Amino acid sequence: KLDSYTHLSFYEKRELFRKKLREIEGPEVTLVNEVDDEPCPSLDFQFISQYRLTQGVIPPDPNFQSGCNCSSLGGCDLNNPSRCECLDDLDEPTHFAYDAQGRVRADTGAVIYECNSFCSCSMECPNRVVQRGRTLPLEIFKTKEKGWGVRSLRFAPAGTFITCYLGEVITSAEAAKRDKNYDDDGITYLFDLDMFDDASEYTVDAQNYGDVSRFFNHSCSPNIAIYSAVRNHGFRTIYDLAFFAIKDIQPLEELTFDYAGAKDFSPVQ
Ligand code: NI
Ligand SMILES: [Zn+2]
Ligand SMILES: [Zn+2]
Ligand SMILES: [Zn+2]
Structure with missing residues (x-):
């Protein structure tokens, strides 16, 4: 029921987005919508x-x-x-x-200590996983009841790294400043970096800058979890929010998480 102009406008918009995705350095990231006409x-x-x-x-x-x-x-x-x-x-x-x-x-806790640029091993050093980045090709898609989500395009064994949650690191101060600006926002891309001391009170905001992960949805029975990876072992005021598959992920399965901190990792309880 879309007229010629709108149909063409939606077409060009979806192509601009796929261009934006082709420019991402790494495995492919695709865009699909089998639910509606939203570009x-x-x-x-x-x-x-x-x-x-x-x-x-x-x-x-x-x-x-x-x-x-x-x-x-x-x-x-x-x-x-x-x-x-x-x-x-x-x-x-x-x-x-x-x-x-x-x-x-599986015997690794909520904290991963990777080798620094001040170490002497090559980039193939087994303790440089997160640093090597994404290896899984992903697809952004329209879910039926939720907005857009992300699903894997390949099978991913439990424990496989997926990607980090990137964004702007803001102070919990401005965080609230923005919190006063969030209007009818269906999703508020906020991620607190409080795995350790709460003095820094730093937060990652992916509203204007981010990685594919800014599209991940929350869920009760997630298949991926945040692993606080650190390189500057001495100053954990800022560290990497790393997503690793917690269980086997079938191809085309949607990726979801639910941050619980070190309050879901180390405890069988
Ligand atoms: Ni198409
Ligand atoms: Zn090292
Ligand atoms: Zn090393
Ligand atoms: Zn070493």
Whole structure:
């Protein structure tokens, strides 16, 4: 029932969005809508691959960073939990967060300690998973009752890294400033970085800048979860919000999460 002008307008809008997706560095990200005629999600945002820092936010200074030098040939060898200085932040059931497959071991907690730029291993170092980024091709799609969601295009074994939640790092102050501007917003892309001290009170906002993950929906029985990955072991005022599959993800299955912090990880209770 759309007239020629509208039909063409929707067509061009959906193509601009797919162009925006083709420009993302990494596996393919597609756009589909089998539910209605909505061209695509709003185009008023920019995809980024790094946190965008704002006014007032004092980022963790990289200068005071510890760099493990236990890089023999390959990475850092996952059999030497007692050799890395990236792991010195805790010694109990010692071990690297990942196995050989690059998946996140089930004995790994809510905190992952990856190697820094101050370490001596190559980018293929098994403890540089998150840093290597997305490997799974994804698809943004129109759900029937919820807005747009994201589903995997390939099967993803439990423990597989998916992507990080990127955005603008704002202070909990301005966060509230924006909270006073959120009008009839069906979704408020806010993510608090309070895994540790609550003094920093920093929050990630993906409203104008973000990654594909800004499209992920919430759910009660999620298949992905946030893993606080850190490189600057000394200053966790800002760290990476990493999504890892918690269970096997079938191809075309929608990806959903529900942040619970370290209050769903370490406890069987
Ligand atoms: Ni089409
Ligand atoms: Zn190491
Ligand atoms: Zn290291
Ligand atoms: Zn390393």
